[PDB]
Amino acid sequence: EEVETFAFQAEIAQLMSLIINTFYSNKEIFLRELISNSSDALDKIRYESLTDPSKLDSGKELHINLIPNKQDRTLTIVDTGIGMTKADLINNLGTIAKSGTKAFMEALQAGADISMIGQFGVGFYSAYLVAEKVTVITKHNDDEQYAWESSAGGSFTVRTDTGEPMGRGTKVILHLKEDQTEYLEERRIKEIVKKHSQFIGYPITLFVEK
Ligand SMILES: Nc1ncnc2[nH]cnc12
């Protein structure tokens, strides 16, 4: 029931402020970037399992689920990948985000655009193109289940998660901005997945709603 609050490193705070406040119409790349992250996490537990099959005792299925919820105005990306320890979460969700931001902003001045964010290892933060808040629920074999959350503004929280047990993996819950609800529509998500993620090597299931 204890919540810890952390400050973002200055460079990540600046990155998030850039993504939040730059005029950039091609916001759909956020989903490509989150699906790519999930794919990398699934590769990692698969790789670990090749020499230690017990790594899959927490779940043998390796997949990515996309879950829109119009009532909550949320779009959730679920994977059964390696997941993240508490230390991984605090360390910028397993990324080298300080140095990657630096490389990304230097690329932006030399004629790169925001869609190239994933080449600098910080594509997670493109979530803020379309979300006002992001909640990440995660479970790694070596640690307990945790919830990370941030509405930008310079800080994030970490707490033990009491929700439904996940087994192993990561859920990225996007609390969408009011003018970005097109990403809850079935036909729009399908369009984006077919365009940017057609060759991902894991089944991607787009859930539907009542
Ligand atoms: N889906 C994911 N799995 C593991 N680490 C991550 N860091 C960011 N997204 C992640």
Swiss-Prot record:
It comes from the Eukaryota. ISGylated. S-nitrosylated; negatively regulates the ATPase activity and the activation of eNOS by HSP90AA1. It is found in: Nucleus; Cytoplasm; Melanosome; Cell membrane. ATP binds at N37, D79, K98, F124. Belongs to the heat shock protein 90 family. The modification N6-acetyllysine is found at K44, K70. Residues 1-210 are annotated as: Interaction with NR3C1. The TPR repeat-binding motif mediates interaction with TPR repeat-containing proteins like the co-chaperone STUB1. Signal peptide: none annotated. The gene is HSP90AA1. The chain holds residues 15 to 224 of 732 of the full protein. Molecular chaperone that promotes the maturation, structural maintenance and proper regulation of specific target proteins involved for instance in cell cycle control and signal transduction. Undergoes a functional cycle that is linked to its ATPase activity which is essential for its chaperone activity. This cycle probably induces conformational changes in the client proteins, thereby causing their activation. Interacts dynamically with various co-chaperones that modulate its substrate recognition, ATPase cycle and chaperone function. (Microbial infection) Seems to interfere with N.meningitidis NadA-mediated invasion of human cells. Decreasing HSP90 levels increases adhesion and entry of E.coli expressing NadA into human Chang cells; increasing its levels leads to decreased adhesion and invasion. This is Heat shock protein HSP 90-alpha. Homodimer. Identified in NR3C1/GCR steroid receptor-chaperone complexes formed at least by NR3C1, HSP90AA1 and a variety of proteins containing TPR repeats such as FKBP4, FKBP5, PPID, PPP5C or STIP1. Forms a complex containing HSP90AA1, TSC1 and TSC2; TSC1 is required to recruit TCS2 to the complex. The closed form interacts (via the middle domain and TPR repeat-binding motif) with co-chaperone TSC1 (via C-terminus). Interacts with TOM34. Interacts with TERT; the interaction, together with PTGES3, is required for correct assembly and stabilization of the TERT holoenzyme complex. (Microbial infection) Interacts with herpes simplex virus 1 protein US11; this interaction inhibits TBK1-induced interferon production. It comes from Homo sapiens (Human).
